[PDB]
Structures are given as structure tokens and as C-alpha cells.
Amino acid sequence: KGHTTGLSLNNDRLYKLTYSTEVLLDRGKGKLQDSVGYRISSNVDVALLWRNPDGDDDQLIQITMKDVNVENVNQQRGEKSIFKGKSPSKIMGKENLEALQRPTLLHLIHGKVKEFYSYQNEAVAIENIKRGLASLFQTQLSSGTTNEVDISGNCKVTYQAHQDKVIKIKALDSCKIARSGFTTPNQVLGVSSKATSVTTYKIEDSFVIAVLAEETHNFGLNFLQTIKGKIVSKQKLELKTTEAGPRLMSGKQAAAIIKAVDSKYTAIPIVGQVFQSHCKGCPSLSELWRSTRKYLQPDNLSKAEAVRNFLAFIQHLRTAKKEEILQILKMENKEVLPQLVDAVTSAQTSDSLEAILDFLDFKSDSSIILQERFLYACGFASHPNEELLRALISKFKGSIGSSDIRETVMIITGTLVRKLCQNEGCKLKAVVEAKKLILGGLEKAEKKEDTRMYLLALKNALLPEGIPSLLKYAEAGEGPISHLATTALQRYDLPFITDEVKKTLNRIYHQNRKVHEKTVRTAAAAIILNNNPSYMDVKNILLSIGELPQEMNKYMLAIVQDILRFEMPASKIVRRVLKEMVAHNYDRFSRSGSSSAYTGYIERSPRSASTYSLDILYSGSGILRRSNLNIFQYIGKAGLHGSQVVIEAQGLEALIAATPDEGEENLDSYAGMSAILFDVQLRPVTFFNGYSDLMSKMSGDPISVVKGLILLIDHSQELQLQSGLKANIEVQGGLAIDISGAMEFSLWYRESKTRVKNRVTVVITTDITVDSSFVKAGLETSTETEAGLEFISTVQFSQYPFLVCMQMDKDEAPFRQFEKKYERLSTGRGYVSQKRKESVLAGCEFPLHQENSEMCKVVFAPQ
């Protein structure tokens, strides 16, 4: 690429320029208000030292900053200004100022940087500023696209040559440079980012006389758009005049001339380099943890401070080393330790992973609870990678003391396969190993408890090549295992639920070959109705209503009514079938029984929506067989399975003097729960198995069920600004869950009351910083809410059918916003401004189906 040309200088002339750079941090409303930052200004001399005697466009220029000063960007700082009465030397340091004002050589070929020269022993931050200024001299007077190296790394660059200007647009996404950072590809939990870099070269009489560059970085939390920030960085380089300059130096090669100019001059890279803050008098991990641990008591995980400390500590862990982490783990007590395992696993660095893997013995039975916390934290890991998968694969291949934990490992492996498959890593080595391990572990049919494990893993991994096995198991008529396979099919996307899939599901629903359980049949029909059902698909299901066992008619009717009521995909085709009186009439649509299905909105906006869904299948006895609660979250087309909570029961008929349905008299009495949290299918939990175990455990006092801290939102950017400054964007979303259940039961009184309280505390933090080592500006915000959702179930079971009143109740929630902006000087408190807002979000009840409202009228009647 030797045809373009950039800057040209005249022999024996010294160019006198002015140079300015400033940075602004803003809350980013769109219009920049009262922001923080700083301006660095100087004079600039440029002299041509050498030109290649071969006549080629090959030159060596010398660039010097003089009269460097650092000032406020904000005009109203007054007596709060960090620079008040301080010399440039006192602001940056004697040695730094000297370094900044020492000259720099730039060897340009065809107007592009061939080599940059400077003094080796200088601070990185300062070499960056110099590199920033030097990078502006690289340009092209004609239009085209190309790849260039400068402060920003190796980037694709586009030039638009106009009459009085050339425009240099840099493709910031394409830049090759080593910078830490990460961001989830999940639209609902993610952070949107825009980076622009535009440099304008002002032309007069074919020569550049000025250079104006503006760089912007915009971020916004997808979920909640009031949480955003902006970085604006500008550069201005103006030619003032020319003077008589040094005489040209003679030589065949540029390198020799440089050694002759000064032999301390060394070739250094033009690309900007990372530098560490270098903390002065800062406490160690153990000192921090000593304060943090006061807030992470199991008793008060619900307070916003707990979550705040959790998130803050995760930042510290992200810079700590294996040993200091391992130490803290080793000296901690049993009560707080689960919280610290949460924090350590969330950190998601090589060092934090190794510290926790080392700390946890999978053969121990004394650290079962911590094994779990570790593994669940990996499930929710915001940015998992091959290393995390590899660790898990090997834990599984190793020895594990508890088989529940062995199951958990395989289940979480499922999620990690899912996540890495959605992040262009479906063909990564450890992914293919874990795929073979799941798909293979499901073909080699071992013990029954082993098939369940693999099915749950596949329920998470959702590999399409697993579907034929799922169909085999759904059809097997193997009860618990058949339902599981069915519910796993239910998680796949519409293009995977083909005709062949629906053909199988039809045979299961219609019982063309053999009898299947009610739970399996209903789930199969749900998948059909939800996945582009044909006219006859819908017609046959409608015609079956009134001809199935007691509660199954009520349930299927409820499913269909809910499709109409909530305008689901198959709405239109169902309405077509409803035209016919034979299918749609007050005989078929008149059902007794308790079973139900209801979908509502939690929140709806033009952009985002949140839904709740409750569907309950009862036994003929009137005792619950299967309830599904589902909460989904949407942003545009993008979705997130926030929550699923499935409750199963069998053989509980003896707890009243009731009798089991036809067939169910040999069924052992059982109650369980299966849950999804933020797209992750968890390990199902048995409440009790068999009569003796039931009569063994047992009442109306709260009982912890799930407790834990989760790092849900996690966005990190390290940025090399074109000016040379260092910028960091960090967005973290943490929450604390605290679910607790209570039941009152009286056989004599024929009454039951169940209360499940879900306590949810969310804290979302943002942090923007620009650092130059002698000065630093930051903008941080904290948004917090202490939410609460309660589900209550009141049962009066004196006469079948029983009175059941269900309630979904969202508590009044406190909502608190914090902002802190600062300008700081490497020593001293600097300028700090803080604001606080504190509102209250109002509570409500969510309606369920109208029949439920009717039963609640009676339950809460005035007498």
C-alpha cells in the first residue's frame, strides 16, 4: 500500500501548533449537563529531521509538547477546583512533566506510521498521551478503506476525501488490542454499547491546517433504560505558523540518523498500553473481607447493603490472586461461608476458579451445601468459557461423595453447553466432549436414576440431535421419566418442533397405541397447541374435550380458553375451529372440576413485557397433581425464562379419608418441586417420598427453601481512548433471593393455608472512569429495590369440590437511587458530589382466572 500520501512538511521549517485534549463523563441523557473530567493543553513544535534520499515519500519528523497544563472542563468548580494554586509540575509530578515535554520521533512512509521513537524509561500513562498526539499525524488525503496501526491498535479505517476536509472514521469494533472485558449476548440481561471515532482533517490549499477528533462511548442497560452513561473525548490540533527550523540531517537509513540524534531513543510501539492504578495505602483482600463479612450474614441477605457489599467485593476478587482468596475461604465459618462461595464463584477469573476448586473437596460430605452454591453460581455465570466447562467435566469424571451433587454437576454442564453454543463456541473441544457425554450418557440406558440425570442435563443443553431420544422417552410410558422428556421438549424453539414431533405427541395425547399418564398427555398437547398446530391438530383436541377423565377435560378446556383470552400464536387457528357449532357449544364448554390455566401481564410497554402463567391439573380426588407457575420477561423479540415453579403430588389421598383415582391405589405418596431460574433448570427437590418418610418429618412456621446471592448482570469494558487516556465501564446487577414456605393443616377443621414468600433484592451499579495517572474522573450510580412476592393458597375441603382461593401479592417496594461524581489528583480527596433519591413503588394483587376470584369472594365473605 504505497500510493497514498498524508502529511508533507517543508525542509528547514518548524511548525508551531496548539494541542488540546479533553474528556467528559455524563449520565448520558443525550444533552451533557453537569459533568466531570479534565482538559490537557500544550504547544506543539514539529520539525522534519530527515527524508529518504531515494526520493520516496519517506520522512522522519520530531514532535514536542511544551507548556503542558491541566485544567477543569466544568466552569463552575470555583473554590472546589482540584487544580487551585498547583503548578503543572505539582499536578503531574516533576519526572512526568519532563517526560511529557521530551521530544518524540515518528517515521512515516506514504503518510503511515512505520515506527515510533521515544525514551524507554517513562511512565506508561505519559507515553500514551504522547502516542495519542503522534497518532493524529497519520492520515491520507484521498478516499478509501484500509488497516492502520495507532494508539487504538490495529483498526479498519475509512477515509472520505472532500473539498476542504478529509474524514477519518475508525471502526472501533475491529481494533486488535489486548483489553479485558465481557458482555452477555442475552438481550434481556445485556448492556447496549456504541463506540464512534471520527477525526476530521481541515484542508487549505491542499495542506492540512487542523485536525479535530471526537470519540464517544454510550452504554445503556437493556432491561431498564434510565441506567446509562456517556464518555466524550475530544482532540484539537491547529497549525498557527511556521518558523525557520533545524537543517535536514543526512544518511541512507532513518535508523542511523536516530542513533545520531540521541542514542537513548528507542523504537517503542505506537499502540496504547495498559497501566495499573498502583494503590497507595490500600487494604488487602483480608482487610476488605473483614468489613464485607459483617453484611453477608445469613440473617440479613435481604437488605440492600448485603447485595451492595457482595457486588463491591466481587470487584476486589477480580484483581486478587489464588492464595489470598484461598486464605479467606480457609478461615471463614460455616454460616457466612456460603455467601463467600457465591462471591468467589461470581468473580469468574482463572485465580478465583482455582481457589474455589482447591478449597472444595467433592468427596467431603461436610461441604455439601458449599458444593451446591459453587455449582449453581456457575449456572448463573455471566460470561462462562471453555475453562469453566473443563473444570466441571473433570469434577464429574472425578469422585463425588453425594450423588445429588453428581446430578447437579451434570445439570449445570447442560447450561454451560447451552451458553457456549449461543456464543459461537458450539464447536469448542470441551463443548463437543460434554455433548457426547450427555447424548451418549442418554443412549447407554443404565439405572433409572441415571437416565433422569441426563434428561435434566439435556433439558438445559437443548441439543436438537437429542430430540429423537426425548420422543423415545416421552412415549415410553415410564411415568416420571416420560413427563421429564415431555417437559424438556417443551423448552425447544418452534423450528425444532416439526411434524414428526407432533405426530408422536398426537399418539401420546390420543392414546392410539397405548395408555399414557394424564400429566404426560396434557404436556404433549400443550407443546402441540404452542407450536404451529394444524387445523386438525386443534380440531381433534377440541373434540376430545368431554370424552377424557374428570379433571383432564377441565384442564384442556382451560388451556384453550387461555389461548383465546391471551392471543397466543395459535389463537387465529383455534378461532377458525370455533366457527363450527359441533366443536364449540355450551355442552362441550360446560365443565365441572377445579383444574385451571391463566396468563396475565406483570408489566407491558411498547418495548418490553413481563407475563405470569398459572396452570393447575387436579386429581379426581381434588388433590393437586401438577401446578406450573411461569414468569417470562421480554425485550422486543428477546425473551428470558425468569422463573418456573412446578409442584407435583401423588398418593396423598390418605391424609384425608379420600380414595385414589382409578389406578392410583398402588402409587406411593410423594411431593416434589422442579424449578427454572433465569433459564436454568435446577435439580428437582423431593419434599418427601413414601408414607413413613412423610409421617416422619412432621408446623406453621417459616422455612428457608432457597437462599443465595446471584450476579445476574455483568458488563466490563477496558478502553484505550485515542487521546491515550484509559477508560473503564462497569455495569453489575446483583440480587438476593430468600424464599420461605409455611403450611397450616387441620383434618378435623378441613382447612389448609399455604404461604410462599419470595423476597427479592436487586442492586444495579454503574461505574465510569477516565484515568491519566496524575488525574482521574469517575461517575458511579447505584439503583436498589427491596421487592417481595407472596403466593397464598386457602383450602376449605369439607365437601368436594373443595373451595380453593389462590392469591399472588406483590409487596410495596422501596426504590433508592445514588450518584457520585468525582475528579481526583492521585493524592487528596479531590472534588466529590453525591445525590440521593428515595421513592416507593406501590403494591398490588395479580388476578388469576375468574373462577378463582369467585372462590375468593366466598372464602373472604363478610362472615
Binding site: 394444524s534 381433534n540 363450527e580
Partner: protein, 461 residues
């Protein structure tokens, strides 16, 4: 290569055209594995099939599982289960639907009625008496000339309608026996008037219009037997008389119903149902009725949506019922939505009380800015809002256009607004179009006032 499950062919998607080719005459049962009527009919079907296997000819009995071979069921327009369709493979363009009885006898007797003549020739008065007595509905065509144009019209209408027996007589002693001077067509039935005489031109078309109209009884009792006949018919407007068998003066009450039925023969199906019967309890719940609220009438229309209608009066004299059906047919009766009783003094207090009955009247008033709290009576959130909402009413009690109201959303149905939580505050401005503005600001007197004064723009867009 289909199997003979009790001498009955099993027809699948792949092998349907081949077997349709290999028999000139084919009777197919479209059924469902879970279907009760298909279960009850399955062995009688096997009988008629078996009886024709060792005595029959070319007519072959087949069955298709429509839940498995659904393409077929759709292709041939199956209605419910079972559906029996007769295929000739001389007309692959439309089979003939079987409509007769479900006994194995009725089948073969219907098959031979395909080969034999549409009507039996009645030589004398005794043969006439016989046929009239053979069925619930019978039709005789009196035609001097059997070869006549008129008479060939009638013989076509007697091939079409298969659920009624037809007779033709050209004997004058028969004519005079039923009091016919000229040619004609008489329908006889064992209910209601007993006899209907055809009028106007003797076209196949005009015949079917006469038969179909006069074949139906005035009133039908709702039973598991009559139910598929009701929902198989073409009348999509039903009036139901919920009449308990135990009620006093059952006969008198049904009598009035039978009377009213006359004025609306072709237009509204008059049905009575035993409100005391256990089987019917589910149906009572569908019409939101209790055993103790009977006797009562309800009218329903059966389209894409089912819509129920209540009479303005509670009296069940033949007059009130006719008056009901008449006002319905005009457009003067409103769909029955769940609603509480409007209190006498619903507008006595600063906060207006709205029910389902008067909701659209108040809220969608073009000249009024109405702000409504939709609540549940047991909800603590709604209970907490009540004092603030009261103070808001108090603020606006003398206003020129703002109305503060409330409605119990669990006790009243409104078609225009969906309530997704309790409480919900919705604003209905003074506007020509039915605009609805959701309020999502602070639940405070201050928040409310700011929103009301901005005309709905400061608290919600």
C-alpha cells in the same frame, strides 16, 4: 391389505385410495379412540359387517382413526365423531353422509335403500296407515301421474332426505282418505299439529324447504341423546328453559314455552332442560344460574363466540317469552355480562360506584373525564388506596367534568378494559373516541391531581 377387525376394514392414509378403488361401494366410519358413541357403535358396526360377510355382496365396511389419519377426515369434511360416509367411487367428489339409526339393522336397511326406490308405492289406505305409523315423521306424495313432472320432483326430494320414509300413491281412495282433491304432498308427524300440507310449486327445492322446516318438533328436551342432534343442526340461536321436574305446574310452564316456540319456528331452537338433574349442574354454571333461581330462560347465540342473553322480565308466560325473543331478534337486548346491582345511591358520594350494567354509560361519556379505580374487595393494596381515593373524590365533587369512580372488577365484567392487577387506575377522557389512559404514577392525592389537571399527560404520556 387392510385388516378385518371383526370383518371391518382398517383404512389408513397410505392405503385409502387403493381400497376405495377395490370396492364399488364403501361405508367408512370416521372415529376417535376416546369417543363414547364410537365405542357404543363399534360392535353393531362389526355385526352389520359380519352379517354382510356371510350374506352380503360388494358393500364393505371400513373405519378410519381420524385422530391418526387426520388429513382424510379434513379432506372429506368430518363434523364430529363418529361420522359415517358412503362412497361409490363413481362420485369421488362427494360421499353421502349416513344420518339414520345406530343399530346394526338400521345400517343394512339404509344400504338397501340406496339400491331400491326412494319411496314405497302405497296401493291402498292400509299401506298408507302403516307407513305413517312406521316413523315419527313420514311424508306421502299424492300424484295421479307417477311419471308426472311434479312426481319426478318429489321422487328426487325423497332420495335426498334419508332420515324420513317417503310414500307415493296414485290411488284415488288414498287421496280421498287424507282429504286431497288435487295432487299434493303431506307430511305426517307424531307430535305438535301431526299433519302439514305442502303449498305452492312442487319443486325438489320447495319440498326440502317444507320438510326440513316441518320435521323439527316445537320443543326439544336436553339429554345425552338429543345433544348431538341439537349441535348437529343448523339453528345457531337457542333459548333454554331451565325447568326443574319437581317444580309446581310443570305442564303449565312447558305449555307456555311450547306456545312461544311457534312464533319462531325456523329462527330459534326452543330447548328445555331439567335444572334438578345432576348431569345438568355444569350447564347451570355455564349460564351463571343456581338451582334456586329456576325456572328461568336464557338465550344464546353460537358463533366464533358464544353470547348469552337474559330476559328483562322474570315472568314465564307465553307472552313474556315471545316478547323476549322478539326484542332479541330486533337488537334491543344487550349481551348478559356478569354485573352487580346498581345501588340506589351509587352517585350520592364524591366517589361514584360503577357496576357492569352502567359502566359504559358513565366511563365512555364523551363530555366527562372519568377516572376509575378497578379493585378486588379482599385486597390490602386496594384497602390502603381507599382513603386516598376518597380524598380525591372529595377534591373533585363539584367539578364541571371530572368524575372519580370505582368498580369491583371481580364482581363485574367489562368488555372494553382488561384489568391485570388490583388496584388498576384507568383514565377515560372527555373524547369522541373511546380513549383509555393507564395511570402508572404515584398513588398519592398529589400524583392524581397533577395527572387529572394535565388532562392525562403528566403521569402517563
Amino acid at each position: 391389505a387392510p385388516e378385518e377387525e371383526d370383518h371391518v376394514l382398517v383404512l389408513r392414509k397410505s392405503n385409502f385410495a387403493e381400497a376405495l378403488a377395490a370396492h364399488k361401494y364403501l361405508l367408512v366410519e370416521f372415529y376417535a379412540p376416546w369417543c363414547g358413541h364410537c365405542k357404543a357403535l363399534a360392535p353393531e358396526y362389526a355385526k352389520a359387517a359380519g352379517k354382510l360377510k356371510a350374506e352380503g355382496s360388494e358393500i364393505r365396511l371400513a373405519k378410519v382413526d381420524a385422530t391418526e389419519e387426520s388429513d382424510l377426515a379434513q379432506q372429506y369434511g368430518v363434523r364430529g365423531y363418529p361420522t359415517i360416509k358412503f362412497f361409490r367411487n363413481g362420485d369421488t367428489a362427494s360421499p353421502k353422509e349416513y344420518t339414520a339409526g345406530r343399530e346394526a339393522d338400521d345400517i343394512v336397511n339404509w344400504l338397501k335403500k340406496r339400491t331400491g326406490p326412494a319411496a314405497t308405492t302405497l296401493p291402498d289406505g292400509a299401506a298408507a296407515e302403516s307407513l305413517v305409523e312406521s316413523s315419527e315423521v313420514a311424508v306421502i306424495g299424492f300424484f295421479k301421474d307417477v311419471e308426472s313432472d311434479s312426481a319426478k320432483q318429489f321422487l328426487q326430494a325423497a332420495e335426498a332426505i334419508d332420515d324420513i320414509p317417503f310414500g307415493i300413491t296414485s290411488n284415488s281412495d288414498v287421496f280421498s282418505k287424507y282429504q286431497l282433491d288435487k295432487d299434493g304432498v303431506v307430511l305426517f308427524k307424531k307430535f305438535d299439529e301431526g299433519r302439514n300440507n305442502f303449498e305452492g310449486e312442487v319443486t325438489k327445492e320447495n319440498l326440502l324447504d317444507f320438510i326440513k322446516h316441518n320435521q323439527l318438533p316445537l320443543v326439544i328436551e336436553f339429554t345425552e341423546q338429543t345433544a348431538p342432534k341439537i349441535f348437529g343442526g343448523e339453528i345457531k340461536t337457542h333459548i333454554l328453559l331451565f325447568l326443574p321436574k319437581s317444580v309446581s305446574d310443570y305442564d303449565g310452564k312447558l305449555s307456555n314455552f311450547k306456545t312461544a316456540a311457534e312464533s319462531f319456528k325456523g329462527k330459534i331452537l326452543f330447548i328445555f332442560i331439567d335444572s334438578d338433574h345432576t348431569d345438568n349442574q355444569r350447564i347451570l354454571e355455564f349460564f351463571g344460574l343456581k338451582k334456586e333461581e329456576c325456572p328461568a330462560v336464557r338465550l344464546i347465540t353460537l358463533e366464533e363466540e358464544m353470547t348469552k342473553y337474559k330476559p328483562e322480565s322474570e315472568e314465564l308466560t307465553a307472552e313474556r317469552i315471545t316478547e323476549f325473543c322478539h326484542r332479541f331478534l330486533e337488537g334491543k337486548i344487550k349481551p348478559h355480562l356478569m354485573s352487580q346491582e346498581l345501588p340506589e345511591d351509587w352517585d350520592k358520594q364524591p366517589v361514584k360506584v360503577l357496576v357492569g350494567k352502567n359502566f359504559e354509560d358513565v366511563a365512555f361519556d364523551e363530555k366527562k373525564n372519568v377516572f376509575v379505580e378497578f379493585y378486588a374487595p379482599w385486597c390490602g393494596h386496594c384497602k390502603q388506596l381507599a382513603p386516598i381515593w376518597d380524598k380525591l373524590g372529595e377534591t373533585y365533587k363539584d367539578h364541571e367534568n371530572i368524575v372519580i369512580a370505582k368498580m369491583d372488577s371481580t364482581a363485574n365484567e367489562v368488555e372494553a378494559v382488561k384489568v391485570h392487577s388490583f388496584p388498576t387506575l384507568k383514565f377515560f377522557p372527555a373524547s369522541a373516541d373511546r380513549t383509555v389512559i393507564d395511570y402508572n404514577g404515584e398513588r398519592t392525592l398529589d400524583g392524581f391531581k397533577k395527572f387529572l389537571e394535565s388532562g392525562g399527560q403528566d403521569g402517563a404520556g
